[PDB]
Amino acid sequence: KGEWLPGLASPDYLTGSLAGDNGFDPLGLAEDPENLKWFVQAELVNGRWAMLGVAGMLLPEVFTKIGIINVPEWYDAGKEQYFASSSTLFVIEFILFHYVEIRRWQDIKNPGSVNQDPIFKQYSLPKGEVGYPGGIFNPLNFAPTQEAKEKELANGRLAMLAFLGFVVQHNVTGKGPFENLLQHLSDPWHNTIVQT
Amino acid sequence: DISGLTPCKDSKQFAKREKQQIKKLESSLKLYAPESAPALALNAQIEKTKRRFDNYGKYGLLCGSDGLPHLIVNGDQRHWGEFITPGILFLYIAGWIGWVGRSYLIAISGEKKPAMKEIIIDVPLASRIIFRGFIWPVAAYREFLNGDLIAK
Amino acid sequence: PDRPIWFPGSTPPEWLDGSLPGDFGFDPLGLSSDPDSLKWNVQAEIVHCRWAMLGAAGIFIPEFLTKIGILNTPSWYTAGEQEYFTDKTTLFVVELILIGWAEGRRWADIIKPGSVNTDPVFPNNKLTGTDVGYPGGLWFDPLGWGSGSPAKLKELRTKEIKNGRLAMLAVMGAWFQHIYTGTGPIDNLFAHLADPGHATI
Amino acid sequence: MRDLKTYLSVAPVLSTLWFGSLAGLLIEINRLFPDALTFPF
Ligand code: CLA
Ligand SMILES: CC(/C=C/C=C(C)/C=C/[C@@]12O[C@]1(C)C[C@@H](O)CC2(C)C)=C\C=C\C=C(C)\C=C\C=C(C)\C=C\[C@@]12O[C@]1(C)C[C@@H](O)CC2(C)C
Ligand SMILES: CC(/C=C/C=C(C)/C=C/[C@@]12O[C@]1(C)C[C@@H](O)CC2(C)C)=C\C=C\C=C(C)\C=C\C=C(C)\C=C\[C@@]12O[C@]1(C)C[C@@H](O)CC2(C)C
Numbered sequence: 067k068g069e070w071l072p073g074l075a076s077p078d079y080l081t082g083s084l085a086g087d088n089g090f091d092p093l094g095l096a097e098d099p100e101n102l103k104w105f106v107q108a109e110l111v112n113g114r115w116a117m118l119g120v121a122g123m124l125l126p127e128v129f130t131k132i133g134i135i136n137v138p139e140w141y142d143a144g145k146e147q148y149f150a151s152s153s154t155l156f157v158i159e160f161i162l163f164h165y166v167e168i169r170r171w172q173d174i175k176n177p178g179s180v181n182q183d184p185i186f187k188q189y190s191l192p193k194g195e196v197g198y199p200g201g202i203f204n205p206l207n208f209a210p211t212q213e214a215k216e217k218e219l220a221n222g223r224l225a226m227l228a229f230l231g232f233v234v235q236h237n238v239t240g241k242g243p244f245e246n247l248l249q250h251l252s253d254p255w256h257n258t259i260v261q262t
Numbered sequence: 263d264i265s266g267l268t269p270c271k272d273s274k275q276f277a278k279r280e281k282q283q284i285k286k287l288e289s290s291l292k293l294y295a296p297e298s299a300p301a302l303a304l305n306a307q308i309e310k311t312k313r314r315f316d317n318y319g320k321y322g323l324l325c326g327s328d329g330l331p332h333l334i335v336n337g338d339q340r341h342w343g344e345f346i347t348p349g350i351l352f353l354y355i356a357g358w359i360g361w362v363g364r365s366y367l368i369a370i371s372g373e374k375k376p377a378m379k380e381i382i383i384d385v386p387l388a389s390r391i392i393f394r395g396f397i398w399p400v401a402a403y404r405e406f407l408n409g410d411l412i413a414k
Numbered sequence: 415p416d417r418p419i420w421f422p423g424s425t426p427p428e429w430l431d432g433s434l435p436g437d438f439g440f441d442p443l444g445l446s447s448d449p450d451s452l453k454w455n456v457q458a459e460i461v462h463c464r465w466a467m468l469g470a471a472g473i474f475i476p477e478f479l480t481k482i483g484i485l486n487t488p489s490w491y492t493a494g495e496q497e498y499f500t501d502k503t504t505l506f507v508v509e510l511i512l513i514g515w516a517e518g519r520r521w522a523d524i525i526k527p528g529s530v531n532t533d534p535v536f537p538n539n540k541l542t543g544t545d546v547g548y549p550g551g552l553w554f555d556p557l558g559w560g561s562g563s564p565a566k567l568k569e570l571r572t573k574e575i576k577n578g579r580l581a582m583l584a585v586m587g588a589w590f591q592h593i594y595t596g597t598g599p600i601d602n603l604f605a606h607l608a609d610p611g612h613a614t615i
Numbered sequence: 616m617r618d619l620k621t622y623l624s625v626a627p628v629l630s631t632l633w634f635g636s637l638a639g640l641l642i643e644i645n646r647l648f649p650d651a652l653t654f655p656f
């Protein structure tokens with residue numbers, strides 16, 4: 067589709083048949099079709115996790131402007147006490163995610179081989195793409211046209227960049243992400259990465 | 263106290279070594295006027311020696327019976343900066359260099375006279391290849407998985 | 415072939431055939447023997463000329479008015495040490511970003527001509543230029559004097575090139591005069607006019 | 616000149632330039648951060 071840099075010719079292996087294809091591959095990671103097949107799924111999963119992470123880091127902090135709830139900032143939520151110890155929660159999360167990710171992994175190797183429920187054999191997911199399961203995972207039956215996939219990928223890339231910014235800003239500033247925006251909005255021409 | 267060693271900041275021999283070096287440096291200073299340039303150089307050397315000893319004291323090194331720092335390379339988390347991290351950095355840099363060299367060698371293998379491109383470097387091709395080595399681990403791992411790394 | 419030459423009685427280099435504007439066959443070291451270097455050097459000379467003309471105007475006109483007392487602007491040499499509304503590194507970063515966007519599209523036109531002539535946002539707007547280095551269009555050529563017969567274009571481009579060379583020389587001269595004499599460029603001219611025999615290096 | 620650029624790509628000249636830049640970078644790095652024995656970060 068569009069060009070990430072006008073005046074430069076798109077690589078041949080990027081034929082534009084994929085959603086969100088702008089011909090951006092200066093270092094040639096996706097020359098091998100198997101590598102491209104793996105990296106598409108990797109990007110999809112990374113973005114889908116990153117958007118949720120950013121939503122969970124930003125929104126539970128914007129409460130200060132509204133004063134509705136009281137929750138510690140994203141880097142202090144770990145130290146708080148909970149009804150169960152860290153070890154038990156970590157073990158349960160490991161046990162569940164092992165099964166979930168092993169089930170997801172098998173579809174990349176042999177598509178259409180994990181479409182049937184293992185206990186109740188009369189329940190199955192309708193056939194679809196590798197990274198787009200559908201069925202019960204799409205309860206509202208929104209049509210997955212190419213435009214929506216491009217929107218999803220753009221939002222995922224933006225959220226990856228946002229999470230990287232969130233991580234980097236806290237390391238050097240020592241505060242959360244929302245107050246950094248307010249500090250910049252206070253005096254824009256003096257509060258930047260150049261402190262002076 | 264691994265293997266009977268002691269911290270640098272608690273070692274008396276370390277302070278004795280620092281005092282001896284400072285005293286040796288200060289002896290030559292008395293031969294020159296305070297405003298003379300050699301006096302400034304000697305003052306800078308003394309300040310650098312003091313700063314080096316203070317920095318060695320701050321980093322939590324271990325001293326032996328002779329007042330000299332010793333390096334632990336067994337993998338203890340308290341001493342991961344002596345061997346582990348610089349080793350990983352060196353491995354990354356060496357892999358970058360090797361991958362760049364291998365890619366350049368492979369690229370020119372199909373030319374009519376490949377031996378001519380080895381003594382007279384094709385600068386644009388090398389420059390286009392140089393930046394590619396920044397992600398060498400991923401490329402190497404995927405090449406190994408696809409069976410391309412080893413010649414048949 | 416019959417054009418005036420920088421060194422009358424000599425033979426101009428083969429790669430300089432007089433087609434380019436402002437061509438006098440001056441290339442003793444042959445720095446533009448192959449065509450790619452010729453095109454790159456032509457673009458570099460055009461850019462240097464325009465930047466130098468802007469700099470010469472901005473150095474000499476403000477300093478002239480300050481001497482006669484209409485304005486009280488500081489010296490161009492020390493104009494970088496004043497304090498402004500923000501730190502100088504912030505201004506440098508803003509300049510770098512803006513001029514990177516501006517010069518980035520210029521780099522693409524040199525490598526692949528005719529590829530950056532369309533507005534990314536409003537496709538209805540286009541640049542009408544056809545030559546590399548002369549973008550044209552309403553943004554850069556509002557008065558419409560940039561298109562016409564080849565003779566007019568050659569005359570205008572020769573005028574621009576010669577004026578740019580003069581501006582480059584003038585700017586370098588002003589810089590070295592302020593380095594050596596330690597006085598404003600306008601003061602040097604008045605000193606020379608006072609005693610032309612002795613007001614000299 | 617094409618022939619002048621070709622002579623700059625010969626192995627000894629390129630090696631000399633690369634190693635000179637490398638040595639300058641290393642000398643400057645050691646000047647900024649002298650007496651390094653452990654990685655503190
Ligand atoms: C357009 C170019 C130009 C012009 C008009 C002037 C003019 C002047 N310079 Mg000067 N200068 C220039 C370039 C120029 N310079 C350059 C490039 C340098 C760096 C080497 C210097 C270094 C310099 C010093 C160190 C001093 C002057 C001084 C002076 C003034 C006294 C005359 C003199 O001794 O000149 C000497 C000029 C030179 C040694 C440079 C050679 C001349 C260049 C190559 C241009 C040649 C003129 C041009 C070909 C003729 C057509 C243009 C014409 C319409 C002006 C006078 C106003 C003196 C001063 O302050 O006066 C009180 C002084 O001490 N200049
Ligand atoms: C998944 C992710 C983040 C996920 C976060 C999650 C789940 C949760 C976060 C938490 O906050 C909560 C919710 C609650 C808190 O209490 C705890 C934590 C745990 C803190 C980020 C991904 C982030 C992913 C990023 C930033 C990826 C960047 C990739 C880039 C830039 C690649 C560029 C190129 O590869 C191309 C495209 C083409 C090549 O040719 C050239 C180059 C240039 C190499
Ligand atoms: C190009 C140049 C010199 C040219 C050199 C020449 C002739 C070389 C000639 C040859 O190559 C040929 C032809 C052919 C070869 O075979 C032989 C040689 C002999 C090698 C000078 C200036 C080149 C470049 C110049 C003039 C730069 C201009 C600077 C500007 C715009 C400054 C602006 C400001 O001054 C303001 C306006 C206001 C201030 O407050 C702030 C600042 C920022 C200071």
Ligand SMILES: CC1=C(\C=C/C(C)=C/C=C/C(C)=C/C=C/C=C(C)/C=C\C=C(C)\C=C\C2=C(C)CCCC2(C)C)C(C)(C)CCC1
Pocket residue numbers: 356357360361364402
């Ligand atoms: C444990 C340990 C140890 C010991 C031992 C060891 C470490 C061993 C081994 C190791 C190894 C054994 C590694 C690796 C492997 C590999 C494989 C399995 C295969 C293959 C490979 C290759 C062949 C490579 C190559 C290359 C690259 C990739 C880069 C560039 C260059 C080149 C091309 C060469 C120590 C104590 C010391 C430390 C700690 C840890």
